[PDB]
């Protein structure tokens, strides 16, 4: 289905003030901004893991953190602090037990979701003995299985090899084509070829939301402009990851 979606302080100062943003299903949003600018905080608010002061809508209707957790999937920056299970398939199956229950479908579903992240064959493995990058694939899998309309990914593939990074991004690119809203912060923008909007966070607020073209023309100095985009500006959209073969 379709979907559409402020200030915050932890405990001392306000980190986000006057935040105006809008996200729809079927688009990919990338959030940039320097360190401690609020990217992680902003994504948790969207997820409903932080309670913020202000006005948040979900399809027009006001949205409480709760209602967000209902419709927004999350992947932490640190995937360890996210999973609890005896086996890999146990951490996944966790997210679908409200989903009807229904089992013959779970085992068919979990099957699908492990394949996407590349953990097929490790269903019975013990998460406490997985590598860092493997935990990341698992965190993404338990999030994908909830079947939310929005996915919030705070650096989801930081510890994967480049080919796996592309494979995940490409999964995200096909979820978007199927009516998912993707909000994503990443340093691996090189391996992401399809995306709709870039949001820049500065001074505790969003001072930009536009295309990558508009972003390049912008010339922000607090963030890096991906080399790939300048190349695109000078040489054209060549050497896309789909066309490497």
């Amino acid at each position: 289905g379709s979907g559409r979606i402020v200030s915050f302080r932890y405990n001392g100062d306000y980190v986000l003030k006057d935040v105006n943003a809008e996200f729809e299903t079927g688009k990919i949003y990338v959030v940039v901004g320097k360190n401690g600018s609020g990217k992680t905080t902003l994504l948790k608010i969207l997820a409903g893991l932080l309670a913020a002061a202000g006005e948040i809508f979900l399809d027009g209707s006001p949205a409480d953190p709760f209602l967000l957790r209902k419709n927004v999937g999350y992947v932490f920056q640190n995937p360890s602090s996210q999973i609890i299970g005896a086996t890999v398939e146990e951490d996944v199956a966790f997210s679908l037990e409200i989903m009807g229950l229904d089992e013959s479908e779970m085992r068919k579903r979990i099957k699908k979701v492990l394949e996407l992240v590349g953990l097929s064959g490790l269903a019975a493995a013990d998460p406490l003995n997985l590598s860092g990058g493997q935990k990341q694939r698992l965190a993404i899998a338990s999030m994908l299985a909830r079947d939310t309309r929005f996915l919030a990914l705070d650096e989801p593939v930081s510890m994967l090899d480049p080919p796996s990074q592309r494979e995940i991004f490409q999964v995200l690119e096909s979820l978007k084509n199927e009516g998912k809203g993707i909000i994503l912060v990443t340093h691996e923008l090189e391996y992401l070829d399809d995306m709709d909007f870039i949001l820049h966070i500065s001074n505790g607020t969003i001072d930009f939301c536009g295309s990558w073209e508009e972003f390049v023309e912008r010339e922000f100095d607090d963030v890096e402009i991906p080399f790939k985009w300048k190349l695109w500006k000078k040489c054209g959209k060549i050497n896309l990851w789909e066309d490497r073969y």
């Binding site: 930081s158 480049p162 490497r244």
Partner: protein
């Protein structure tokens, strides 16, 4: 000082059904003062290879020559510092000081470790009074990476190995950490880097070795790498460096902006 790897292979759990061939008959040479990049996908055997060179693993086959001759674990480990890709595999202490001072209290147990730790921490850009008492568990990833490095250069080894030290860092934090690398090799010491971030790391190395499914599928200089290696999955910046190389230019030690004016003209 000088490292030679000669046809080493490595098996985990021989015979048993969970038998894993990590390495297969790999050999290479690392000269003294050399700066080497070890690349290759996940599971290619990068971490294992450098663990064997550091003397943490006894290779199932082959040998490693240190300035010409074999050695045992203890001798190797005094002169080879290795920072693991996951720094929590290194940590065991509740203070940064104790984490760093360890290799000194293990190798040179009469030396006052205080001014040693103080300058190793200074070498990596960690204020001594600000950090000596901090709990490693609650440091930022960049701070954890610094402590991991200081704790392995503290006993003044001649070789430094960094297994994927830039993962989860900013363009800032990466730059500042390579700054630490340049320092190291200004002391004329050899340093090995395991990394997937080639386009950023390559400006700081001499040779590039590539692993794949346990086998070495490339060994050569960085110039050779760009011009000879399969460019099918080079990043956009690597493709520009490669272009420039094939036109007989020197893309290294040149800005991203400067790279771009010399292409697509």
């Amino acid at each position: 000082g000088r490292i030679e790897v000669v046809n080493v292979s490595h098996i985990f759990h021989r015979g048993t059904p969970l038998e894993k061939k990590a390495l297969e008959n790999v050999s290479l040479v690392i000269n003294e003062g050399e700066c080497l990049l070890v690349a290759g996908n996940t599971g290619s055997g990068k971490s294992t290879l450098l663990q064997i060179v550091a003397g943490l693993i006894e290779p199932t086959s082959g040998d490693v020559l240190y300035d010409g001759e074999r050695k045992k674990g203890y001798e190797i480990r005094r002169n080879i510092g290795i920072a693991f890709q996951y720094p929590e595999d290194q940590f065991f202490a509740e203070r940064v000081f104790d984490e760093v001072a360890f290799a000194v209290k293990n190798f040179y147990p009469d030396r006052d470790p205080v001014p040693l730790v103080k300058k190793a921490m200074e070498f990596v850009g960690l204020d001594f009074d600000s950090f000596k008492d901090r709990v490693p568990f609650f440091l930022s990833g960049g701070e954890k990476r610094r402590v991991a490095i200081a704790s392995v250069i503290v006993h003044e080894p001649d070789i430094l190995i960094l297994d994927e030290p830039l993962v989860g860092l900013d363009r800032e934090g990466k730059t500042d950490l390579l700054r630490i690398v340049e320092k190291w090799k200004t002391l004329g010491k050899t340093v090995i880097l395991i990394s997937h971030d080639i386009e950023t790391v390559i400006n700081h190395v001499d040779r590039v070795v590539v692993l794949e499914k346990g086998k070495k599928v490339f060994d050569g200089t960085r110039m050779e790498f760009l011009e000879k290696y399969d460019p099918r999955f080079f990043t956009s910046k690597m493709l520009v460096m490669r272009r420039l190389v094939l036109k007989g230019e020197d893309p290294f030690s040149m800005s991203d902006d400067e790279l771009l004016e010399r292409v697509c003209n």
